[PDB]
């Protein structure tokens, strides 16, 4: 069998570079040549206890690429007193009755590991589980780093924005720490910095990392440019417009921005990448998300397929 | 100094004699590891002076055993607990706490959003020592905290 | 032809006895060998007017289990001035022009069966009309019984919980009262008995019934037994707590109970049974939610398939 | 019967033995009415060779003693038990739990509804026997429970 | 030196037959002759942290009959003090030392209770708690009754509806089981009889009670008819529309009844009262309201004024 | 002739240390000689745009102390003034031909302001614009603290919890920065520091400051200890709870400190202030709440008043 195959995936950390590098070569082989009743007559539930529309129409594109039947919901709705209702445990143990596997979101962190208790031999992945983990959001971003840039070692990457509840950052950060020889730029605001605990796990690896102000200081030395929506509710309205200006990117930033950089943008984005710098060849945020489309069915046949013969 | 002659703590022909307890943890530990849920008779001495190293704790199990991880588990309360294994009326055997990998069912993670915070899960910690202190992970949460702030209150 | 085909599937009690042993040898069979092409090119409306996701994930999945397509909605949302629209009866009209046959599930009494007097030749199957019916239910709690049980005659059946509201126990009971040789004991609390109305059913057909004060005085007698929710709304919440405790089935009230007997439960469950009863083998309530995915399939086999050659 | 088998046996000169208390109902009196926390000596014997037969718990505090009110708290969990009043190593006193007027802080409200749930108050239920059947009334939501009911936490 | 001068009312079983009659008598005299400036320079609040407009208004026009200021608010769907994170302790600290006396509605039982705990010398007064307590219905009850019979001993009192759930219909028997000679007809549904600790309670007085069918039953035996809405939300639509027809009361029911005979209904009532009965010398609910003026003037006078002048 | 009749009252720093003693003043001898009928035939307006069930109170009382009467509302969700369609422009327009005077409250910052532009004659005070003022609060707490300190000069003044969204900790530091000889110790997170520009202006000054990781760091130099609710939505559930361990404030932490000191808290509490504090001679919040009175009844007379005979 492969290695991923009847897992639950629930966090980066749980799995090893190799683990990574499997996920993504398959993504790379079902880019290229596409297997659409490679899960024919299996049915995946799409749980969204929290929407998430982006998220949510990903995954379902990726299993009907695959041939899989598809039966979910996205909720919001009428769950403001379903706590007087039943447990997530029960819940998953009725569903792991019905369907091959789960892809849930869910508003608790854990949430997507506790499921993975109960749902007995029915593979789990996580969609997104509070602010902990969002496994498919990092691979698809190491695929499109990987797939434009040609490696996960030897790179530089900025991240660039809120560091410090920015999930995908701290996730990807986690991920590229796995790989060689990266050397890390983040350009926070001083209230929204990389966290402390990061910045512990790179030192002791003895991962080159460094503090920058703005972007022009080593915009010629990035390979990878990694923005951030910078959460507005999360600041003083005020308090963001006095620095809002500082960490926006604007065509004109990239004049001497490498040939090979990317600019890359996980999620809704909003006045932090000016639509000017989407006309340029930098910009890879939208195909980026078109790569979810792999990532995800990478996920999907390595999980539920014993054996692939891509 | 467990010598003590005065008309008190009495020896056991079996069991476990657990010695060395700080005061105010050793109810603590009957508590939070449920010790009293068993019919075998039990002794327990509770502010005890332990010769003059302040006041401890004493618990004795007759006829009861326990495995090097349950003496593992105690590692956080009382890390300088003693635990006495007795057949036949002497210690055939000493051990102390030694601070675990993990910790099962009795701690509560300090995140209120931990989903471990609702449902049938028993919590369990992976724990590691740092400068000062030890940090928990979560087995849900996946948040890390010193065990100072696990411990709250 | 099958005797169901092309038939509306309203109420249980429009079903005999020999229409329930037909549901259930398919179900069986169906469980056995899958038929996952049957329902190919057909195409389902499930239209839930009133939510409820376990019912109708239950049913989607057996749609897509087939074969089958499934178009529909899950409804709650701005209806609460939709009496100012159109009709239900010209919805059904619009609908049954589209669709093969429609599931459906409705907040009230009866629209089920009105619906069927608009669709046409198209099948209407009845997921719930208000406090009224539920016949899929009734037929995997059969199914159930019947599978672990081994027969539908000569058993004792005990039904625990609210009996007064608990429309799935008023309608197993009259399905049980079709086969023979069946003894009843209830043990509700006196605000919510089973109603009059059943008891004199039974009388009439000379069935054995009883009135326990508690469990213990059968638990060793019962080979079924069926708990329901206590709705606590239906109570004051005094009250709820003062008799709370004499209904609440624990590991620990099983010890003395007969090696078949099944312990059932219908929908979601709180503190009416604690999870300790989970671990031992007379747990039989998520067993019991599978297998509405085979009760399920077989009326869709049946109902749209002429014949049936399993 | 002071515990007199062999020697080194268990006694204190000036304190409160509580003793006969039902098997098991023994811990429940130490979390319930927080007796350990003192810095005083206390000695406990849980699942003891019981007075005829069968077990027994036994609390001894010394230098401490408990008015008829405290003694009274205890006729819920251990009617049976009687407190000693001991001084000068003798046994000056003997009472026994009588039915209190009220129980304060131990019991909890079964109505859910109730106000005392949500918020700072401690819990207070009116003590009132049914032929044996005793029934409690909650002092705030003034509803009334048998003990039995109320006696699930 | 009045006995009630500046004490709490929360409970009706807290008063006495001697407190309840200085109320009524008070009460009489304010609604002869008026004080309009009694309670000037006064503040009180009004303390709805559950909407009851009825109530609400009859409090506040008592309020300022008397001539005091009113501070309050109304329907804490999500206020601060009650339902975000403030306790109720910290509030009544808080507003107990702006106002001079407080009368609060609130959704749980006990709460008018605990305040008293955190109002210091203020006196709080209870509107309704939960399912509990109401004591300013009730002394408006008993005024109406007494006003239109001459006593509040030796009557022949028919309560109607929901005897279960209407906390008014227990209130008003425990406190005319304080005097002498009354004999209770409880005419209600099976489903909603009086609760037993009532009858029990009247039986360790010795007071006569009885238990009926219907109305016509007793029709001429009674002088007061006191009528409670039956909550059709507390039971099924169908099992509702099944028994009252023995339950609403037309003026025809009335040919036969006492002259002295008086119809109460603590309000609001929905079909239990014909209009027809509205027009007849014996309707004497908007009655029964407007004493609810006279009933609230005279507590508020009586707990803030150590001795009534008039 | 008062220097504040028929003045705004919207920002602190549009009051000298004169207007400010001023005001405490008038409020110490209306807390001593009451005049409940100074502002008589007055009529105020208390235009809650944002609830604020607290302050609305305070001020409404603060109102009928005096004897004016009052009209206003609470809470536009959706008020056709502010939030439909209408101007705030045209709302005070109206109004001001109405009433005497207005207070108002509005979740827009300078909106207190603006309405003092269109409401003519008729004075203005601000009972909270966004995050910026909230004049009342702090006259409140300046009040308070000389009350029990007896003086407003040279204290030792701790503020702990959320220095940096604090409104009301920046308007205390201000104007206690207006008065000579006050150190201040800053005990908060990181995450929550007191802004810049506030340590800046306390520099210009030459006010002796200094930041503090914990309360009991510097418990004995203290005369008052500021408590400001920690906004948890503010960040991170698992961030925040690392923190609260260093500021939330129990009484045994009290056990050092002077007996002059005494605990203030704006309210509402959450879980900083543990309930054992409410019964030490130092707890000082409730007291701080009921001299909100005095403060503002200071104030509506101040400015509807040319001047006091007191
Ligand atoms: N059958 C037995 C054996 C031992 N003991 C208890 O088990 C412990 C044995 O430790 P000990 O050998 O006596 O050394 P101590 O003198 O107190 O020194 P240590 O303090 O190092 O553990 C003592 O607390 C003793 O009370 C007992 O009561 N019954
Ligand atoms: N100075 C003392 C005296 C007595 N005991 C305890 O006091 C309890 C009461 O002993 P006593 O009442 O004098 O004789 P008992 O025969 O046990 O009384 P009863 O009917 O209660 O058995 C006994 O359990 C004994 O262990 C003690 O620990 N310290
Ligand atoms: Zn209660």
């Given at each position: 069998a492969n290695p991923l195959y009847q897992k639950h995936i629930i966090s980066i950390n749980d799995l090893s570079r190799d683990d990574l590098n499997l996920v993504l070569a398959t993504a790379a082989k079902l880019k290229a040549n596409p297997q659409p009743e490679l899960l024919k007559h299996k049915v995946i539930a799409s749980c969204?206890?929290?929407?998430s529309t982006r998220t949510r129409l990903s995954f379902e594109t990726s299993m009907h690429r695959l041939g899989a039947s598809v039966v979910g919901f996205s909720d919001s709705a009428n769950t403001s007193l379903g706590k007087k209702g039943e447990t997530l445990a029960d819940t998953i143990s009725v569903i792991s009755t019905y369907v091959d596997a789960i892809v849930m979101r869910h508003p608790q962190e854990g949430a997507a590991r506790l499921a993975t208790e109960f749902s007995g031999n029915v593979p789990v992945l996580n969609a997104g589980d509070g602010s902990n983990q969002h496994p498919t959001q990092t691979l698809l971003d190491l695929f499109t780093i990987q797939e434009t840039q040609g490696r996960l070692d030897n790179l530089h990457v900025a991240m660039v924005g809120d560091?410090?509840?920015?999930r995908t950052v701290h996730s990807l950060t986690q991920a590229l720490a796995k790989f060689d020889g990266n050397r890390f730029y983040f350009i926070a605001p001083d209230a929204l910095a990389m966290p402390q605990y990061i910045l512990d796990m790179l030192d002791e690896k003895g991962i080159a990392w460094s503090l920058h102000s703005s972007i022009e200081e080593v915009m010629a030395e990035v390979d990878i440019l990694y923005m951030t929506r910078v959460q507005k509710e999360r600041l003083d309205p005020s308090e963001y417009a006095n620095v809002k200006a500082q960490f926006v990117l604007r065509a004109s930033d990239l004049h001497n921005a490498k040939a090979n950089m990317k600019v890359l943008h996980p999620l809704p984005r909003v006045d932090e990448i000016a639509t000017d710098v989407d006309k340029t060849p930098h910009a890879w945020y939208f195909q980026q998300a078109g790569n979810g489309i792999f990532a995800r069915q990478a996920l999907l046949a390595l999980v539920l397929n014993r054996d692939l013969v891509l | 100094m467990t010598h003590d002659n005065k008309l008190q703590v009495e020896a056991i022909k079996r069991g476990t004699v657990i010695d060395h307890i700080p005061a105010q943890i050793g109810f603590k530990l009957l508590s939070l590891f449920k010790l009293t849920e068993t019919d075998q008779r039990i002794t327990i001495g509770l502010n005890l002076p332990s010769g003059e190293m302040g006041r401890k704790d004493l618990i004795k199990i007759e006829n009861t055993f326990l495995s090097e991880d349950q003496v593992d588990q105690l590692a956080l309360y009382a890390p300088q607990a003693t635990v006495n294994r007795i057949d036949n009326y002497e210690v055939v055997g000493k051990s102390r706490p030694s601070l675990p990998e993990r910790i099962d069912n009795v701690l509560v993670c300090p995140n209120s959003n931990c989903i471990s915070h609702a449902e049938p899960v028993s919590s369990s910690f992976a724990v590691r020592k740092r400068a000062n202190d030890i940090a928990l992970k979560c087995k849900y949460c996946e948040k890390e905290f010193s065990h100072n702030v696990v411990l709250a209150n």
């Open positions: 969204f206890f929290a929407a560091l410090k509840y920015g | -």
